[PDB]
Structure formats: structure tokens, C-alpha cells
Design a binder for this molecule. Structure first.
Ligand SMILES: CC1(C)S[C@H]([C@H](NC(=O)[C@H](N)c2ccccc2)C(=O)O)N[C@H]1C(=O)O
Length: 241
């Protein structure tokens, strides 16, 4: 088993595949988990999603690296055997966009916040091939997110980064907060180096209001949690201002 220094541990319901871990969350949704080995510190887990939508699959976030992201595509090929139509990546940091080149080599259409694509070169990332844009209330402009099936993309405002986006899975009670949301038992909001400490609390709450009936909150570095992940994150963020 993989025992990361940071990130959730393995429990019943987890499938080890190569260097990665997969967990079924719903009949059509799986969480992918990949691990960055930090020398002298140990492994840091990062989570994303895989969603089946009829005869195709949709991905949220890459793994940390190209090779790990290729392993995600191999797991999808083995376990689902349907083509990946597109991937949405949730901001320009390594845990979310480190594996773009693997997606592109596979011919998968990639989407990110226009701002994430603009920041990518400055963050040592490769931009997605398509840019999402957002309304004044945070909802994605639908013309920029064609054929997204159940993925409902919401920009909650600046928080963990200025470009962080979130994704609800329509037809389920699952919503994905990425690195913006930490779990209900977290001590810290994680890396605040690129964070907006003034607006973080409002952005966390806006995510909760965007998906008000999501009962399972998925996030980058903990196991899926209740809505208390959202409220606890917001309460921690209240202390930043
Ligand atoms: C788990 C993290 C504390 S690190 C990760 C991200 N950092 C990276 O992807 C870095 N490339 C990195 C550097 C050193 C060690 C691990 C990751 C960030 O800055 O938000 N997301 C952070 C977070 O979600 O709070």
C-alpha cells in the first residue's frame, strides 16, 4: 500500500494500479490519486476525477506528472474501455496540470480557465488547448464548454489561487473543489503562496452556493467529505482577513 505523508490513506474500496490509486465514488464517477515523492518528506497525494458519460469518459485534473497521467489513461482503457473526450484542469499548478503533455499525446481535448492558460508558462506548465471563460457570477460561459455532458464548471472567485475553478457532476450529488477546499478536519489551508487571502472565504462559500445539494465534496488532498469541508474551509479562511 501507498502511505503518503500528505493526502488520504488507503481504505477499503481503493484499487492500486501501477503507482496510482482509484476509488469508485458513484456508478459513473471515480477518483484518481497520484503521488509526488518529495525528497526527504515523502509522498504527497493529489486527487482528480474520472466520469463516464454514455460512450465516453471525461477527466478532471491531470496527475502530478506525464507518466502518472498516462497511467490514468491506461486504467481507463483497462477498466472502462471508452475514449476520453476531454479533460478539465482546475488551475495552473503541478498537481492539477503537471501531466498535460500526456493528455495531448493521447489526442484528448483539454480545457482550463483562460487565466490558467495565461499563467501556465509562468508556472512551468503547458496550457490547455482551449480556454474557459466565466460570467460575473462565476458560471462558465457555455459556448466555451461545448459538449461537457454532466460537468458543470464554476469559477468561485480567487482563493487558493486567482484562477482556481471547481466542477459539479450533474446527475450526481458530487462536486469537486480541487485545492480550494480542504477537509472538515484540516488544520491548514495548504499553500497560501499564490492565494488571495482577502477573498478566499467568500470564494469557498460561493462554491458551496453553486452546488447547494452536493453532499459529497471531493478535493485535491483528502478523501471525499461532507459539506463540512466547505464550511470548515470558509471558517479557516475567515481568519485570513
Ligand atoms: C498540497 C499543496 C500544499 S502543494 C500543491 C501546489 N504545489 C505544487 O504543485 C508544487 N509544484 C509543489 C512543490 C513542492 C512540493 C509539492 C508540490 C500548490 O502550490 O498549490 N497544492 C497545495 C494545496 O493544495 O494547498
Amino acid at each position: 500500500a501507498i502511505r503518503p505523508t500528505i493526502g488520504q490513506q488507503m481504505e477499503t474500496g481503493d484499487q492500486r494500479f501501477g503507482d496510482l490509486v482509484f476509488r469508485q465514488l458513484a456508478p459513473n464517477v471515480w477518483q484518481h490519486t497520484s503521488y509526488l515523492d518529495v525528497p526527504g518528506f515523502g509522498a504527497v497525494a493529489s486527487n482528480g476525477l474520472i466520469v463516464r458519460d454514455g460512450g465516453r469518459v471525461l477527466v478532471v485534473d491531470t496527475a502530478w506528472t506525464d507518466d502518472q497521467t498516462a497511467q490514468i489513461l491506461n486504467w481507463i482503457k483497462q477498466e472502462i474501455n471508452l475514449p476520453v473526450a476531454l479533460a478539465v484542469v482546475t488551475h495552473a499548478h503541478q498537481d492539477k496540470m503537471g501531466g498535460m503533455d500526456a493528455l495531448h499525446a493521447a489526442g484528448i481535448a483539454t480545457y482550463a480557465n483562460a487565466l490558467s492558460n495565461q499563467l501556465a508558462p509562468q508556472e512551468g506548465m503547458v496550457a490547455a488547448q482551449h480556454s474557459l471563460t466565466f460570467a460575473a457570477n462565476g458560471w462558465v460561459e457555455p459556448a466555451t464548454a461545448p459538449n461537457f455532458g454532466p460537468l458543470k464548471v464554476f469559477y468561485p472567485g480567487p482563493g487558493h489561487t486567482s484562477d482556481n475553478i471547481t466542477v459539479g457532476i450533474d446527475g450526481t450529488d458530487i462536486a469537486f473543489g480541487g485545492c480550494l477546499i480542504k477537509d472538515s478536519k484540516a488544520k491548514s489551508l495548504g499553500n497560501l503562496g499564490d492565494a488571495d487571502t482577502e477573498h478566499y472565504a467568500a470564494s469557498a462559500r460561493a462554491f458551496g452556493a453553486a452546488f447547494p445539494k452536493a453532499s459529497m465534496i471531493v478535493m485535491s488532498h483528502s478523501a471525499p467529505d461532507s459539506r463540512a469541508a466547505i464550511t470548515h474551509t470558509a471558517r479557516m479562511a475567515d481568519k485570513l482577513r
